[PDB]
Structures are given as structure tokens and as C-alpha cells.
Amino acid sequence: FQKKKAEVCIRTSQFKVNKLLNRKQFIVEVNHPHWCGTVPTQLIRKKLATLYKVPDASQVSLFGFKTKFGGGKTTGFGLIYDDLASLKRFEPNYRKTRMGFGKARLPARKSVKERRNRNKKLRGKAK
Amino acid sequence: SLARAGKVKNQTPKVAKQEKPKQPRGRALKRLKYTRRFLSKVHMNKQPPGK
Amino acid sequence: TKTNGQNAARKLVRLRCRNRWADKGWKRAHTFSARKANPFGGSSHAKGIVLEKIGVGAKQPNSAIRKCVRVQLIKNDKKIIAFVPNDGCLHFIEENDEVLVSGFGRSGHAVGDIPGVRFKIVKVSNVGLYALYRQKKEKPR
Amino acid sequence: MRNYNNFNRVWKAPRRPFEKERLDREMKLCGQYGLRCKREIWRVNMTLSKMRRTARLLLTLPENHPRRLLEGSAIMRRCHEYGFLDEEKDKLDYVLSLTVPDILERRLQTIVFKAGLAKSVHHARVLIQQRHIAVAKQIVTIPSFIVRVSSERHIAFADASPFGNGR
Amino acid sequence: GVVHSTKMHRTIIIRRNYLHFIKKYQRYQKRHKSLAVHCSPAFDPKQGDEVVIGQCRPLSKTIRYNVLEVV
RNA sequence: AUUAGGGUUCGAUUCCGGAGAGGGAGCCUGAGAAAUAGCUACCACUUCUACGGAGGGCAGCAGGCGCGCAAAUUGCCCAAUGUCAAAACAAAACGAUGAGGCAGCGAAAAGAAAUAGAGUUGUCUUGUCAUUUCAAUGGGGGAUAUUUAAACCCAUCCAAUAUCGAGUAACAAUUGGAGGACAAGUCUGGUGCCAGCACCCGCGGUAAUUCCAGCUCCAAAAGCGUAUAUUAA
Numbered sequence: 001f002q003k004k005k006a007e008v009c010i011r012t013s014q015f016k017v018n019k020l021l022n023r024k025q026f027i028v029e030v031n032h033p034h035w036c037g038t039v040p041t042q043l044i045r046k047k048l049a050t051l052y053k054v055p056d057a058s059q060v061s062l063f064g065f066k067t068k069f070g071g072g073k074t075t076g077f078g079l080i081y082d083d084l085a086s087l088k089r090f091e092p093n094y095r096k097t098r099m100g101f102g103k104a105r106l107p108a109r110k111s112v113k114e115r116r117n118r119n120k121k122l123r124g125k126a127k
Numbered sequence: 128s129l130a131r132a133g134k135v136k137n138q139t140p141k142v143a144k145q146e147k148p149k150q151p152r153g154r155a156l157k158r159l160k161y162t163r164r165f166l167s168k169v170h171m172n173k174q175p176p177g178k
Numbered sequence: 179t180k181t182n183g184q185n186a187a188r189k190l191v192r193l194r195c196r197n198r199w200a201d202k203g204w205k206r207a208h209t210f211s212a213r214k215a216n217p218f219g220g221s222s223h224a225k226g227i228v229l230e231k232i233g234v235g236a237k238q239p240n241s242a243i244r245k246c247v248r249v250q251l252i253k254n255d256k257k258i259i260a261f262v263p264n265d266g267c268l269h270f271i272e273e274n275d276e277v278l279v280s281g282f283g284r285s286g287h288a289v290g291d292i293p294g295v296r297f298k299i300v301k302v303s304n305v306g307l308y309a310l311y312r313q314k315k316e317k318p319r
Numbered sequence: 320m321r322n323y324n325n326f327n328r329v330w331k332a333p334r335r336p337f338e339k340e341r342l343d344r345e346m347k348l349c350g351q352y353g354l355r356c357k358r359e360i361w362r363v364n365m366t367l368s369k370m371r372r373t374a375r376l377l378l379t380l381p382e383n384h385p386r387r388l389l390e391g392s393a394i395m396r397r398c399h400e401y402g403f404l405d406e407e408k409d410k411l412d413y414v415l416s417l418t419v420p421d422i423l424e425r426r427l428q429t430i431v432f433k434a435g436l437a438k439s440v441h442h443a444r445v446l447i448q449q450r451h452i453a454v455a456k457q458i459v460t461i462p463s464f465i466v467r468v469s470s471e472r473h474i475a476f477a478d479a480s481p482f483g484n485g486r
Numbered sequence: 487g488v489v490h491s492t493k494m495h496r497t498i499i500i501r502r503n504y505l506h507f508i509k510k511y512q513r514y515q516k517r518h519k520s521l522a523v524h525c526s527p528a529f530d531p532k533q534g535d536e537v538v539i540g541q542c543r544p545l546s547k548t549i550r551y552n553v554l555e556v557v
Numbered sequence: 558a559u560u561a562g563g564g565u566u567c568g569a570u571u572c573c574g575g576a577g578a579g580g581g582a583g584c585c586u587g588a589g590a591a592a593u594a595g596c597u598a599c600c601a602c603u604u605c606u607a608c609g610g611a612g613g614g615c616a617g618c619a620g621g622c623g624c625g626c627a628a629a630u631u632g633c634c635c636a637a638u639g640u641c642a643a644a645a646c647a648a649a650a651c652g653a654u655g656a657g658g659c660a661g662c663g664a665a666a667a668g669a670a671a672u673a674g675a676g677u678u679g680u681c682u683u684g685u686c687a688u689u690u691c692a693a694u695g696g697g698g699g700a701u702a703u704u705u706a707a708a709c710c711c712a713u714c715c716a717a718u719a720u721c722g723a724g725u726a727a728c729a730a731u732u733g734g735a736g737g738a739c740a741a742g743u744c745u746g747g748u749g750c751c752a753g754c755a756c757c758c759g760c761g762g763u764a765a766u767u768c769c770a771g772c773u774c775c776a777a778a779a780g781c782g783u784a785u786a787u788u789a790a
């Protein structure tokens with residue numbers, strides 16, 4: 001054993017170009033032989049953006065990372081969109097909330113259900 | 128009569144269990160039993176004679 | 179001796195159907211008389227209320243007073259005799275106590291030297307009787 | 320509710336609970352291979368019984384029956400791959416002669432012991448459970464892991480283990 | 487089928503005798519079915535005659551077949 | 558499910574078909590209903606009322622009460638799978654969904670798997686023993702984080718400059734047994750046909766291999782007894 005700096009190497013598999021949703025789809029597998037814990041998603045995002053010559057890193061979407069048993073390797077799914085606008089238009093809202101530009105959470109569904117059920121007793125102007 | 132229920136259990140002098148060292152559990156217990164039964168007409172619990 | 183004909187299937191089917199009734203176990207399994215007469219109504223256990231503590235003398239050549247309780251079953255008001263299965267465990271049982279009863283192991287047959295009892299106590303006041311016996315629990319109230 | 324994930328048992332108890340010869344033989348197998356309980360021997364017993372039943376069913380058929388040619392080939396392939404049978408013998412009748420130690424020999428515990436990485440099968444068990452053993456650089460923590468013949472040369476201490484290249 | 491009765495007007499009863507195999511006893515049972523069949527005046531079948539019949543739309547509460555030929 | 562084979566048995570329950578929505582019967586609308594979180598009436602129960610009147614249908618989800626030997630939360634969510642629909646997503650602008658999914662409770666059942674590994678001196682080639690040495694590792698505590706709709710679990714790690722923890726490893730395994738069937742004591746105290754055991758055979762009446770206990774031993778083991786059914790036997 002020799003003590004050395006933590007290194008992270010990105011690999012990409014099953015690459016596909018999607019014109020329909022303005023993005024590239026691929027599985028991303030990360031190798032981190034000496035990494036303390038899990039490599040955060042933002043780090044993999046920056047590394048992948050540098051690797052694929054993407055002008056901006058926010059147009060890369062990553063999710064569903066599964067660390068391998070035994071350590072030293074994690075695998076996930078990645079999306080590189082043609083630009084930021086495509087990303088914000090086509091992304092599921094929870095993934096946009098992960099990257100910080102999602103929508104606010106709606107009120108509790110119990111309250112919406114109760115208000116909807118109250119209105120069924122009312123006629124026009126009141127409801 | 129029903130009045131003698133529990134006669135012998137109540138009569139029996141109370142004897143405390145003695146604090147023995149703890150036996151190994153699991154695979155180690157099997158290891159111990161294997162090294163006692165082998166690697167050592169066989170009587171597994173032979174008692175001293177007595178009257 | 180038996181019929182052997184190649185087209186004699188109906189005779190064999192009817193013969194087996196008729197003779198299957200001679201098997202006591204099959205007949206008990208395919209009739210309602212045992213289930214009706216059975217105080218548990220086909221259940222494995224039954225809850226009941228203790229009417230009185232009684233002493234049943236063991237059968238010859240044994241000589242003992244087997245401690246039992248007369249209990250009325252909650253589900254159907256049937257009255258049975260149930261054995262109290264350990265040393266001094268009769269003192270855990272009081273009149274009007276709620277009691278859980280099981281079979282004695284021989285599916286309605288009497289067991290051991292206890293003459294006509296086919297039941298035993300396993301719980302009293304919702305705690306295991308053997309648990310009270312080993313002082314693993316306390317009797318409520 | 321509406322969940323279709325399968326599951327099955329892998330072992331069965333002996334028909335006679337107290338046979339002195341069976342009990343002694345099992346205690347011997349436990350001591351020599353360092354097992355935790357009789358359930359491991361009985362799991363091997365079920366595996367062997369299934370394989371032998373398949374072999375009997377296949378041997379009853381005429382030699383050129385397509386089912387025999389397919390499944391006999393598959394079972395010979397599996398037996399050779401996992402080292403249950405010697406690669407020399409290749410007939411369908413040699414599966415019938417497989418014994419419990421033949422399968423027990425291919426456990427990762429026994430293999431680690433026989434490879435010298437451990438002083439005993441009991442050392443091998445705790446070595447495997449503590450992530451010090453890797454098969455083709457993959458940490459294997461299961462002592463009942465059945466080792467293929469091809470994987471026998473790749474069993475070393477794990478890189479992340481303090482006995483390999485780890486802190 | 488074999489003609490069983492000719493008592494009705496334009497309708498006859500036929501029998502289909504067959505052997506039914508009981509798997510457990512590896513043996514057969516004699517069984518029969520009975521079908522009410524419309525018989526056209528173009529035929530004069532008698533008891534014991536063999537007839538070919540064909541399925542048609544319901545012609546009455548029981549009749550679902552028509553006599554097509556009398557052997 | 559069990560099974561050499563032939564068979565025996567179970568199938569309320571996830572898929573398919575049928576049927577019903579307290580009981581009965583009628584019906585309108587509609588492509589489709591004899592619909593029931595539609596209507597009409599009667600029979601039972603039953604809720605509000607100012608006594609004029611007006612209401613109700615969990616064998617949907619959750620949850621009560623009863624019944625019983627007997628079966629969870631009045632939880633989160635539409636992220637996934639689908640359904641409907643005037644409807645892609647997004648832009649002031651987020652469709653509904655207890656269907657479904659997710660978690661809670663859950664030793665029905667199923668899989669993998671800890672409770673230790675190597676030694677040193679003497680004692681008695683081993684093996685037990687009192688030691689007195691090393692390492693190793695999870696349970697557990699945490700996190701740059703990961704997962705997840707969000708949480709929770711799993712995995713990853715205990716520096717990458719910078720990260721906690723075992724020695725009675727007290728982080729202490731149980732449930733049934735030890736006359737036979739049936740693996741394991743002709744041990745020691747107590748009791749004295751009593752108390753009790755014992756599925757069956759039997760044991761107990763003052764030297765109990767069988768009860769009540771201690772010790773020791775046996776079997777299965779994170780499981781192991783008991784009851785009732787049922788299959789083999």
C-alpha cells in the first residue's frame with residue numbers, strides 16, 4: 001500500500017444519440033480505486049463535461065448511481081443535452097430540483113383533496 | 128383433595144446455577160465438538176461410579 | 179379377488195367409492211358428525227372460562243390426582259375437562275379466569291392415565307401457562 | 320400482493336433424526352470443512368440429489384434422444400466447469416458417482432485453505448467473511464461460493480485488504 | 487349417431503355411444519349422450535339407423551342439429 | 558403440497574372466467590348497466606332536526622366495534638406501471654388517480670450469513686488447562702457523500718492535507734431432551750404410587766437411569782417446542 005491522491009476515471013457505455021429529446025444517452029461507470037466514500041454526482045458531472053467537450057456542465061444530467069459491492073467502482077446513467085434550454089424543458093422536475101432549478105413543491109395533496117371535496121358542495125361564484 | 132398441588136416443587140431446596148465460562152457459538156462450537164469427539168466403545172457422558 | 183375387464187372401469191370406481199367408507203379416518207374426514215361433536219368445532223385451540231378446579235384420579239395401575247379444570251368454551255358454551263400440565267400450575271388458575279385450551283395430542287383420544295380428558299391448558303389471563311411456570315412472566319391483576 | 324418474485328428452498332432435513340452413523344459422518348464433515356451447521360451439508364445434499372435425479376432421467380432415454388444430447392452436454396459442462404468431475408471422465412454416468420466431499424471441495428473456504436492463503440479452514444472462513452479474499456479482483460465474502468476451475472488461479476488477497484494493497 | 491326415438495313430429499332422438507377412459511384404473515367406461523335432432527321429410531329414419539347430423543342455429547329449446555344423411 | 562411409479566390432497570387469495578355491492582325487486586341514461594362512491598320502492602338496522610322535514614350503504618384505502626385460535630398505518634407519493642381525457646413537455650401556466658408505487662408494522666414462508674482467528678510458556682505427539690501476546694472484522698457511530706419523488710434501507714469509506722470504535726471481544730444463544738423407540742448419565746441432592754412425568758411402552762409405594770433440581774452430556778440452532786389439519790410413512 002502506498003498513500004496517493006484520490007483519482008477518478010470516467011467510462012461511458014451503450015452510447016446513443018437522441019435527436020427526439022436533444023440529448024445523448026449513455027451508461028456512465030466510474031472507477032475510483034482510492035476514494036473515501038462515494039464520489040459526489042457533481043464531481044462526475046464536471047469530469048464528464050470536460051471529457052465530452054461540453055461547453056457548460058449544467059446541461060449534463062446524471063442519476064441512479066449504484067456503487068459496486070467490494071468498492072472502487074460505481075455505475076450510473078448519464079444524459080448530455082444539446083443546451084441548457086433543452087435540459088430545463090425535457091427533464092423530469094425532480095432531477096431539475098436536484099440540480100437547483102426545479103419547481104417548488106406543491107401544497108400537500110391531502111389539503112388539495114379536501115378543498116376539491118369541499119367545492120363539490122358549492123355552486124358557481126363561491127367555489 | 129387438590130391441596131397438595133406443587134408439593135414437590137415447593138419442597139425442593141433451591142440451588143443456584145454456578146457461573147461457568149461462556150462456550151463458543153456457531154462454527155467454533157462445531158470445531159470444539161469435532162476436536163473433542165475426534166483428534167483425541169466410546170461413552171460421551173461417562174459418570175463417576177457411585178451408590 | 180377383483181374384476182379385470184378392459185371396459186370394467188365403472189365397476190372399479192363404484193367399488194372403491196363404496197369401500198372407502200370402511201376406512202375410519204376417511205369417513206371421519208368426509209362427514210360432519212365428528213366436527214359437530216367436537217367441542218372445538220374443528221379448531222386447533224379454543225378460549226374458555228374456568229368453572230371449577232377438579233381432581234381426576236389417574237387410571238390403574240397408576241395412582242395420582244391429576245389436576246384439571248372444568249371450563250365452558252366461549253364460542254359455543256360447551257363444557258369440557260382440561261388438564262393443567264405441570265407441577266403446581268393449578269395455583270396459576272382461578273375461577274372465572276379466561277383460559278386458552280389446546281388438544282392433548284391424539285386428536286380427541288384420551289391421553290395417558292387421565293381417564294376421559296382430551297384437552298390441556300396452555301394460557302391463562304392471556305399469558306402462557308408454561309411461561310408462568312418458569313417465572314418468565316407474571317400473572318396480571 | 321401482485322408481487323411475482325420467485326423463491327424456493329435449497330435444503331431438506333434427513334428422514335431419520337437420530338442415526339448414529341449419519342450423525343458421526345456429518346460431524347466429521349463439519350469439523351474437516353469448518354461448517355457452522357448441518358444445513359450446509361443438507362444444502363449440498365439437495366444439490367447432489369437434484370443433479371443425480373436429472374442424470375437418471377437422462378440415462379433412461381435412448382442415447383441419441385435430443386433431450387439427452389442437450390441436457391447431458393449441459394450437465395457435463397457444468398460439472399467440468401466447477402470441478403465436481405475430473406475433465407478426463409465425460410460420460411453421463413459419472414454424475415451418478417458424485418459425492419458430498421466432491422462439492423464441498425469446491426467451496427471458497429476449502430479452496431482458500433488449500434491454496435495456502437489460510438492456516439486452516441477456520442482461518443479461511445473468517446478471512447472470507449472479512450473481505451480479505453478476492454476472486455478475479457472481486458471481493459467475495461461468501462464461504463459457500465463454489466469456485467470454477469477457471470477462477471482458481473485468480474484467488475488472491477483483496478487489493479483493498481491490509482493483506483493486499485490496502486491501508 | 488344412431489337413431490333412438492322417432493316419436494316426435496319432424497324431430498328424432500339420437501344416441502352417441504362412446505367409451506370414456508378413466509386414467510387411474512387404465513380402463514374404459516360405457517357412456518352415452520342424447521341429442522334431439524330435426525329430421526326433414528326428405529328422410530325416413532328408423533330406430534337403430536345410423537345418421538349424419540350437422541349443427542345449426544337453435545331450432546327449439548333442445549334442437550341444435552339437423553339430419554343430413556341416413557345410412 | 559407430497560410423490561420411484563401409480564396416486565392422495567389443497568386451491569377464499571396476485572393471471573383468466575363468473576358473480577355481488579345490507580337484503581329483494583324495478584328502472585333511466587347510455588354504444589355498453591338491470592350500474593349501486595346512479596335513481597325508485599319496500600324490509601331490516603340507522604344519522605340530523607327548530608318536529609315542518611331531510612338523510613345513509615367501506616365485500617375500495619386507512620381506521621373502529623364486534624366476532625373469534627386467527628391477520629398491519631385513520632402514514633408518503635403520483636417518480637415508476639397503467640387508466641381516463643378537450644390532454645406532449647415547457648413557458649404567469651405542475652390534470653385526477655388509497656389503481657398503483659414507497660415506507661411503517663410483520664420470526665407465515667424463503668436466501669445469505671456473526672457470536673471469533675492465529676499463537677507463547679508451563680501444566681498435562683497430540684488435545685484440555687491458567688495465561689499473556691499479536692493482528693483481523695463486522696454489530697454499532699458517523700459522512701464529501703450515495704440511494705430516494707422525498708425519506709428509509711442496501712451498497713462506498715473511516716482520507717484524498719484533514720475522519721471513531723471489542724478482551725470477561727459482559728457486543729455474554731436458545732429451545733427441547735439424556736430407560737426404549739431415539740442422539741445423549743447405571744453422577745449428586747430432594748420427594749416417597751405424593752407431587753409429578755409419560756404422544757406409545759412405562760416411571761414414581763425411602764438406593765427413581767423417567768418426577769423436582771444442580772452438574773455434565775445430546776440434538777437442531779437464530780431458531781426451537783406445542784395444538785389442529787393434511788401428504789408420505
Ligand SMILES: [K+]
Nearest residue numbers: 578592593594
Ligand atoms: K361499480
Ligand SMILES: [K+]
Nearest residue numbers: 320659660661
Ligand atoms: K408493505
Ligand SMILES: [Mg+2]
Nearest residue numbers: 567568569570
Ligand atoms: Mg381460488
Ligand SMILES: [Mg+2]
Nearest residue numbers: 572573574575
Ligand atoms: Mg378475479
Ligand SMILES: [Mg+2]
Nearest residue numbers: 577578590592
Ligand atoms: Mg354488477
Ligand SMILES: [Mg+2]
Nearest residue numbers: 579614615616
Ligand atoms: Mg356489510
Ligand SMILES: [Mg+2]
Nearest residue numbers: 591592593595
Ligand atoms: Mg343499482
Ligand SMILES: [Mg+2]
Nearest residue numbers: 594614615617
Ligand atoms: Mg362504497
Ligand SMILES: [Mg+2]
Nearest residue numbers: 607608609610
Ligand atoms: Mg320552521
Ligand SMILES: [Mg+2]
Nearest residue numbers: 579580593614
Ligand atoms: Mg339499497
Ligand SMILES: [Mg+2]
Nearest residue numbers: 615618619620
Ligand atoms: Mg376499510
Ligand SMILES: [Mg+2]
Nearest residue numbers: 569570615616
Ligand atoms: Mg372481507
Ligand SMILES: [Mg+2]
Nearest residue numbers: 615617618619
Ligand atoms: Mg380496507
Ligand SMILES: [Mg+2]
Nearest residue numbers: 627628663665
Ligand atoms: Mg398470525
Ligand SMILES: [Mg+2]
Nearest residue numbers: 320618655657
Ligand atoms: Mg391497494
Ligand SMILES: [Mg+2]
Nearest residue numbers: 747763764765
Ligand atoms: Mg433419593
